[PDB]
Write an enzyme that holds these catalytic residues in place. Sequence first.
Site, mmCIF file in Angstrom:
data_model
loop_
_atom_site.group_PDB
_atom_site.id
_atom_site.type_symbol
_atom_site.label_atom_id
_atom_site.label_comp_id
_atom_site.label_asym_id
_atom_site.label_seq_id
_atom_site.Cartn_x
_atom_site.Cartn_y
_atom_site.Cartn_z
ATOM 1 N N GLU A 148 0.826 -1.210 0.000
ATOM 2 C CA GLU A 148 0.000 0.000 0.000
ATOM 3 C C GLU A 148 0.851 1.246 0.000
ATOM 4 O OE1 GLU A 148 -3.090 0.096 2.918
ATOM 5 O OE2 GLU A 148 -3.735 -1.941 2.545
ATOM 6 N N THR A 208 -8.008 1.305 -19.891
ATOM 7 C CA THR A 208 -7.860 -0.063 -19.456
ATOM 8 C C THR A 208 -6.751 -0.663 -20.264
ATOM 9 O OG1 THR A 208 -9.441 -0.922 -21.106
ATOM 10 C CG2 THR A 208 -10.302 -0.259 -18.972
ATOM 11 N N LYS A 265 -8.174 -4.509 -23.463
ATOM 12 C CA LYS A 265 -8.915 -4.487 -24.709
ATOM 13 C C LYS A 265 -7.923 -4.512 -25.890
ATOM 14 C CE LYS A 265 -12.753 -1.862 -22.659
ATOM 15 N NZ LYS A 265 -12.251 -1.961 -21.275
HETATM 16 C C1 LIG Z 1 -1.889 0.947 5.470
HETATM 17 C C2 LIG Z 1 -3.127 0.657 6.276
HETATM 18 N N1 LIG Z 1 -4.356 0.419 5.780
HETATM 19 N N2 LIG Z 1 -5.353 0.219 6.749
HETATM 20 C C3 LIG Z 1 -4.694 0.299 7.892
HETATM 21 C C4 LIG Z 1 -3.271 0.569 7.753
HETATM 22 C C5 LIG Z 1 -2.343 0.751 8.902
HETATM 23 C C6 LIG Z 1 -1.715 2.146 8.821
HETATM 24 C C7 LIG Z 1 -2.252 3.196 8.042
HETATM 25 C C8 LIG Z 1 -1.674 4.467 8.051
HETATM 26 C C9 LIG Z 1 -2.165 5.571 7.194
HETATM 27 C C10 LIG Z 1 -2.324 5.335 5.833
HETATM 28 C C11 LIG Z 1 -2.750 6.363 4.978
HETATM 29 C C12 LIG Z 1 -3.010 7.633 5.483
HETATM 30 C C13 LIG Z 1 -2.816 7.878 6.837
HETATM 31 C C14 LIG Z 1 -3.062 9.269 7.388
HETATM 32 C C15 LIG Z 1 -1.745 9.991 7.627
HETATM 33 O O1 LIG Z 1 -0.703 9.604 7.045
HETATM 34 O O2 LIG Z 1 -1.737 10.969 8.412
HETATM 35 C C16 LIG Z 1 -2.383 6.856 7.690
HETATM 36 C C17 LIG Z 1 -0.566 4.712 8.850
HETATM 37 C C18 LIG Z 1 -0.031 3.702 9.646
HETATM 38 C C19 LIG Z 1 1.173 3.978 10.504
HETATM 39 F F1 LIG Z 1 1.537 2.988 11.263
HETATM 40 F F2 LIG Z 1 2.152 4.359 9.705
HETATM 41 F F3 LIG Z 1 0.895 4.920 11.360
HETATM 42 C C20 LIG Z 1 -0.598 2.435 9.627
HETATM 43 C C21 LIG Z 1 -1.373 -0.452 9.003
HETATM 44 C C22 LIG Z 1 -2.080 -1.823 8.989
HETATM 45 C C23 LIG Z 1 -0.233 -0.470 7.961
HETATM 46 C C24 LIG Z 1 -3.171 0.809 10.198
HETATM 47 C C25 LIG Z 1 -2.597 1.134 11.276
HETATM 48 N N3 LIG Z 1 -2.061 1.432 12.252
HETATM 49 C C26 LIG Z 1 -4.488 0.522 10.274
HETATM 50 N N4 LIG Z 1 -5.200 0.571 11.399
HETATM 51 O O3 LIG Z 1 -5.238 0.148 9.116
HETATM 52 C C1 LIG Z 2 -14.576 3.615 -22.487
HETATM 53 C C2 LIG Z 2 -14.581 2.627 -21.333
HETATM 54 N N1 LIG Z 2 -14.110 2.987 -20.136
HETATM 55 C C3 LIG Z 2 -14.097 2.185 -19.055
HETATM 56 C C4 LIG Z 2 -14.550 0.861 -19.079
HETATM 57 C C5 LIG Z 2 -14.518 0.019 -17.824
HETATM 58 O O1 LIG Z 2 -13.635 -1.100 -17.873
HETATM 59 P P1 LIG Z 2 -13.755 -2.237 -16.745
HETATM 60 O O2 LIG Z 2 -14.741 -3.212 -17.351
HETATM 61 O O3 LIG Z 2 -12.367 -2.774 -16.677
HETATM 62 O O4 LIG Z 2 -14.310 -1.559 -15.519
HETATM 63 C C6 LIG Z 2 -15.105 0.322 -20.331
HETATM 64 C C7 LIG Z 2 -15.625 -1.110 -20.365
HETATM 65 N N2 LIG Z 2 -16.088 -1.534 -21.663
HETATM 66 C C8 LIG Z 2 -17.289 -2.343 -21.826
HETATM 67 C C9 LIG Z 2 -17.244 -2.915 -23.227
HETATM 68 O O5 LIG Z 2 -16.944 -2.154 -24.164
HETATM 69 O O6 LIG Z 2 -17.459 -4.114 -23.422
HETATM 70 C C10 LIG Z 2 -15.114 1.248 -21.492
HETATM 71 O O7 LIG Z 2 -15.588 0.852 -22.680
HETATM 72 C C1 LIG Z 3 -10.249 -5.318 7.911
HETATM 73 C C2 LIG Z 3 -9.853 -4.958 6.494
HETATM 74 N N1 LIG Z 3 -10.764 -4.764 5.538
HETATM 75 C C3 LIG Z 3 -10.473 -4.430 4.259
HETATM 76 C C4 LIG Z 3 -9.166 -4.274 3.778
HETATM 77 C C5 LIG Z 3 -8.902 -3.877 2.334
HETATM 78 O O1 LIG Z 3 -8.312 -4.897 1.519
HETATM 79 P P1 LIG Z 3 -7.573 -4.495 0.138
HETATM 80 O O2 LIG Z 3 -6.214 -4.069 0.632
HETATM 81 O O3 LIG Z 3 -7.597 -5.805 -0.595
HETATM 82 O O4 LIG Z 3 -8.336 -3.340 -0.462
HETATM 83 C C6 LIG Z 3 -8.057 -4.448 4.733
HETATM 84 C C7 LIG Z 3 -6.621 -4.293 4.272
HETATM 85 N N2 LIG Z 3 -5.677 -4.626 5.310
HETATM 86 C C8 LIG Z 3 -4.470 -3.841 5.513
HETATM 87 C C9 LIG Z 3 -3.528 -4.677 6.358
HETATM 88 O O5 LIG Z 3 -4.007 -5.235 7.362
HETATM 89 O O6 LIG Z 3 -2.339 -4.816 6.048
HETATM 90 C C10 LIG Z 3 -8.428 -4.803 6.123
HETATM 91 O O7 LIG Z 3 -7.490 -5.005 7.049
#
Ligand SMILES: Cc1[nH]nc2c1[C@](c1cc(-c3cccc(CC(=O)O)c3)cc(C(F)(F)F)c1)(C(C)C)C(C#N)=C(N)O2
Ligand SMILES: Cc1ncc(COP(=O)(O)O)c(CNCC(=O)O)c1O
Ligand SMILES: Cc1ncc(COP(=O)(O)O)c(CNCC(=O)O)c1O
Lengths: 442, 442
Positions: free
Chosen positions: A56, A234, A237
Amino acid sequence: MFNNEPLEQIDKELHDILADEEKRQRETINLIASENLTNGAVRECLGNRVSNKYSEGYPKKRYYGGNDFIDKIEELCQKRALEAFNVSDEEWGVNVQPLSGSAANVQALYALVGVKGKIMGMHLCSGGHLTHGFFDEKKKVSITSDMFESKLYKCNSQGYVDLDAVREMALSFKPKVIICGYTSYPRDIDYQQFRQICDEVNAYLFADISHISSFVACNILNNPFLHADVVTTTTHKILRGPRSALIFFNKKRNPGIEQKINSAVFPSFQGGPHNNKIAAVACQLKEVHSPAFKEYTQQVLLNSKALAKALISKQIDLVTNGTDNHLIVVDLRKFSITGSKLQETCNAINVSLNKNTIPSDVDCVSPSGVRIGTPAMTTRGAKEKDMEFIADVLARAIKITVDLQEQYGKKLVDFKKGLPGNAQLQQLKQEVVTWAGALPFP
Amino acid sequence: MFNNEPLEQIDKELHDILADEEKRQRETINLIASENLTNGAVRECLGNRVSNKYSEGYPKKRYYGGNDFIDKIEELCQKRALEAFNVSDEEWGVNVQPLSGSAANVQALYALVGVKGKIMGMHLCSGGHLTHGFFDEKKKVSITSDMFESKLYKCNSQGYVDLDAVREMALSFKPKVIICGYTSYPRDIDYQQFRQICDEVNAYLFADISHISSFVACNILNNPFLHADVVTTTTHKILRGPRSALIFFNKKRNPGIEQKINSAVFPSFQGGPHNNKIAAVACQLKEVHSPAFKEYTQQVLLNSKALAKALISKQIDLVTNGTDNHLIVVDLRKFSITGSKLQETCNAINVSLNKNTIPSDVDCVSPSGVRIGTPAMTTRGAKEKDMEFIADVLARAIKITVDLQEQYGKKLVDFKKGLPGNAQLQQLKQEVVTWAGALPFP
Ligand SMILES: Cc1[nH]nc2c1[C@](c1cc(-c3cccc(CC(=O)O)c3)cc(C(F)(F)F)c1)(C(C)C)C(C#N)=C(N)O2
Ligand SMILES: Cc1ncc(COP(=O)(O)O)c(CNCC(=O)O)c1O
Ligand SMILES: Cc1ncc(COP(=O)(O)O)c(CNCC(=O)O)c1O
Ligand SMILES: Cc1[nH]nc2c1[C@](c1cc(-c3cccc(CC(=O)O)c3)cc(C(F)(F)F)c1)(C(C)C)C(C#N)=C(N)O2
Ligand SMILES: [Cl-]
């Protein structure tokens, strides 16, 4: 403490269906304008262990340990993406994390206008995408009509973008964004003219080039990068990459756009990037910049022109009476059949296409056309001479559809009773299969 | 008209980096609580030609031809998903199209409350996800704080959820949804208590079980399905699937929720599904329901308990002083070092973890802890006895971090000049590589 026996062993049930799917792909005339076939290398990236890594954020600024080689992959993909579309990294930036086209678009629009912000896009029925603000009197079908205030410009009765309508609408409505570049538009776009309407109203120029990207990279069609603030596309395509997307942004025209778009993708909308995608995109973008791929893209337009020409020579009407690109929309009003019927008929003969509106379509419950396109079949080695057969196959399918409707009725549930075991359809399928199954398959 | 050379030949530059990434994964002690390692079967699904198919819509109601075998895969994945979490298809539904966890959550929240709607989630600093409504004084960081009206509940100074504070907040704020289930929360959740708070103020109960999903399926931890209206989960963490997500919805409690959630996923937010993901999700969901996988998941908790215990035996403080699940949060205040420093130190010795807040933190600029977890190492075969070694390595890294900060200073830019060529780190890295490199690796 895991199971490492092959897919075929661990899950024979699933492996049968995938093997089925592979046979159907090999044995289909695939005319879906938005589909293509990826090579083994792109599919090797998608199956790579790199999808294990959480990463991330952005290069050098990762919330997890162990991202050193992921940073190189992500920076390589950005580099190759700017190279493919012939842009300088001084002037243009690219985010490579968006998971697909629709996500890329909502993210990019949010970056530009925020919640409740105003946008303008082409209407669905006229060839615009769902993510360009689409809605109905009944409901806000796309999030882009709800989280934003959207307004939709229609094409004229011949199917062409009416710039006079776009300007008139922009002057009264005053959007922060005007979206051009479309899903089922068979002609090229006057971006300069869009740029001139956007300068008038101080709106951003959004070009979505998903359907035409390869043409833009190879200099065969107009280049929105001369005029546009943001360019989305995208990668799955005509460009022939994995399922993913790219948001391009013009730093020179808009200082500070880079952080807005990057913060929009993450952390506003997405979490972890899908590194297997980014790898796969990196790989295909290298192919895109070779002159061999330009030959492929040229062939796509050569096939599309011929296919358009052969259909007209068999008295089939086309929206705009032709095409400047990879796609055609057939108007089926003269045969008194719907595209929903022709799609089923064509499915019964291993011809893949979609139902599509035409300008006269008042309601999407019965679209009056189908859209077809050449990228897929051009990937399989079909040349201009091969387009007369596809045109003949589609002609025969229209006629069979007309017969079936006469026999069983205009009701769709009834029409389907006509399809199974039909002797002509079985005969046409066999012809389709024998020619399709012969073609090179990646 | 494509290049079918293997990845190594077509793109040697990219192939080397991926070979490098594979080497680093093999020789790393991976303690990222959200990471795991996929088997070759899941990776065969991800590279399958099924990703060539556009299949916008839902099984049987597709906007493209040629979707017969895709429909079987998508209905198989839904079936296997409902089986894995021990719910009946008569009471529970599942969407399998969301591209990742963040997308799933924004889509599910939108379904329930719409734009401007009110939601409550746990604060980021207290262990909540970004997609649970996260914002700060300066900006709406997540779209879930902007497209929705969000308010955030904090945990107490010991790190536990304060249900009193959640009740108080719910009565004044009156959200339409309450999110529980978290990212860096080391204890189990009293969902019934949440269900009680939601019934009081007519809110929906949203459980995001991404981090604890395998425990919920295998019946080791509390089951939110008895109480919640909606359950989301990613498939790439403890569950050990590909990068994807699942939205589950309670039809009995909420007739018509099925349409809302399905329309929220498409056409509101997404376009085409990523069928290679859905195939991959199908494959792993079959493994999830086996007794072999429950054994794995039991081992995750046995490893996490032991790792907590061994760290405490070396005088290292843990938030909530322990764990009920796969994850631990180490409080580093007693050593006067930051989590950002320990992450770099650990990256230098091939120990992958993340910096993480603790309840006393007022800025994410200087987080006071690191989060660690056992799913990944448990997949590599590490037993309870092995956790003392991991605990030893982490203790040594903290000590070296203290030494380096003493020698080079508190400044993060200064601290990193300490890390390269440091003899002890080279010694520890060498020790890490030797043990990690030997373990089973899917
Ligand atoms: C990257 C991410 N996604 N969701 C999370 C995180 C975590 C996270 C997000 C952030 C985070 C990410 C984006 C934006 C912000 C706001 C800012 O930077 O002020 C914070 C920061 C931290 C840390 F430790 F650096 F402070 C951690 C971690 C799992 C990496 C987090 C915590 N703590 C929690 N609770 O949840
Ligand atoms: C101009 C344009 N922009 C964005 C998207 C979205 O792509 P995702 O399906 O990856 O979300 C499409 C999908 N095109 C549908 C089709 O022509 O069959 C598109 O034609
Ligand atoms: C509880 C929870 N829900 C949803 C998401 C989102 O998943 P995607 O990253 O696939 O969007 C996270 C990501 N978890 C961040 C971490 O624990 O490292 C999560 O911890
Ligand atoms: C499925 C999809 N995604 N983006 C599209 C479409 C297209 C489409 C969307 C829709 C569509 C999708 C979701 C919701 C709605 C609104 C409604 O059902 O009234 C229409 C309908 C059609 C057709 F032909 F059935 F009328 C086509 C096609 C490329 C398949 C479309 C058109 N025409 C355009 N312009 O863009
Ligand atoms: Cl993928």
